[PDB]
Structure formats: C-alpha cells, structure tokens
C-alpha cells in the first residue's frame, strides 16, 4: 500500500527500496508513493503512513518530501484538504513538499477544490520524480 522509492543507477526508474537493494535514495530526500486515490476513505492512512515510512520524526536531516502522484487517478474534497495540510505542516517544520507526475485531470480536480493558493502553488508540481529531485536538491 505505501512505499519509499529509490533510483536505479543510471536511470530515470524508481523502485521500492525494500524490494530492490540496487536502488539508492538521495540524502535528505524521501520519495513516498501511494495508490489510485487520495480521498476520504484513505486520507488518514496516507498521512499516517507518510509520517511513519519516511521517518521524518524530526529526528533525521530530511529536508524534502517528493510525493509520487503517477498512480493517483482520483482526488476528492477531503483528500485535497489532507494533502494541503500535509504540505503546510511539513513546511512549518522545515520540510519542502513537492509533487511528481500529477495528471491533468487530478490537477483539474484540485483546482476546483481551491487547493492552490499563494502558499500551495503549482510550482510544487513536476513532470517526473526526476525533475522533482533536481528541484529539491537546489
Ligand atoms: Na521496479
Ligand atoms: Zn522541493
């Protein structure tokens, strides 16, 4: 259900770190992946799993979270609420939250839900996990 991703060397391919020893994460960056939806039924699991699987217990030097939305087909009002809080709360404790591969329909659903404001902007969105890493690295 929830996974942390790492890079296959010399590629643009990201796989589960706990299923492929060959992949390596980037220092200070955690890449978190969920499934088809972020909506009312699983937004609580998502935030919980995001805190746990990443280990940002304010106990490590993780400065950036990348959310892999490639699998996400559907978002609803609660899902959007939750995601927005995730971003603002991680921001408050020094963690940049960026989103990879958010499809046009999801972006559209997010905008209808007034997800984007001066704080949460579309500049947090990237075409790929790759582009996101580059950005989070500065
Ligand atoms: Na793989
Ligand atoms: Zn970033």
From Swiss-Prot:
Cellular location(s): Cell membrane
Region Extended region for STAS domain: start-end pairs: 1-138
Subunit structure: Homodimer. Interacts (via STAS domain) with CALM; this interaction is calcium-dependent.
The family this protein is said to belong to: Belongs to the SLC26A/SulP transporter (TC 2.A.53) family.
Domain note: The anion-binding site in STAS domain is lacking. The STAS domain mediates dimerization, with both STAS domains latched onto each other in a domain-swapped manner. The N-terminus domain is involved in dimerization such that each N-terminus domain embraces both STAS domains. The transmembrane domain consists of 14 transmembrane segments organized in a 7(+)7 inverted repeat architecture that can be divided into two main helix bundles, the ''core'' domain and the ''gate'' domain. The transmembrane regions are domain-swapped with the STAS domain containing N- and C-terminal cytoplasmic domains.
Other comments on record: The anion-binding site that controls electromotility and associated charge movement in mammalian corresponds to the central binding site of the anion translocation pathway in non-mammalian.
Function per UniProt: Electrogenic antiporter that exchanges sulfate or oxalate for chloride ion in a strictly coupled manner with a 1:1 stoichiometry. Adopts a dynamic conformation, which alternates between the exposure of the central binding site to the extra- and intracellular solutions leading to an inward-to-outward conformational transition during the transport cycle.
The protein's name: Prestin
Species the sequence originates in: Gallus gallus (Chicken)
């Amino acid at each position: 259900q929830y996974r942390i991703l790492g890079q296959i060397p010399d590629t643009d391919i990201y796989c589960d770190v706990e299923e492929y020893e060959e992949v390596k994460e980037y220092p200070g960056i955690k890449i978190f992946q969920a499934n088809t939806s972020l909506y009312f039924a699983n937004s609580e699991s998502y935030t919980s799993a995001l805190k746990k699987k990443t280990g940002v217990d304010g106990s490590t030097n993780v400065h950036s979270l990348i959310l892999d939305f490639a699998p996400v087909n559907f978002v609803d009002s609660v899902g959007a609420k939750t995601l927005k809080s995730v971003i603002k709360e991680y921001n408050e404790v020094g963690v940049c939250v960026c989103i990879a591969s958010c499809s046009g329909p999801v972006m559209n659903e997010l905008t209808r839900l007034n997800f984007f404001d001066n704080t949460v902007t579309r500049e947090l969105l990237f075409h790929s996990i790759h582009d996101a890493v580059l950005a989070c690295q500065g």
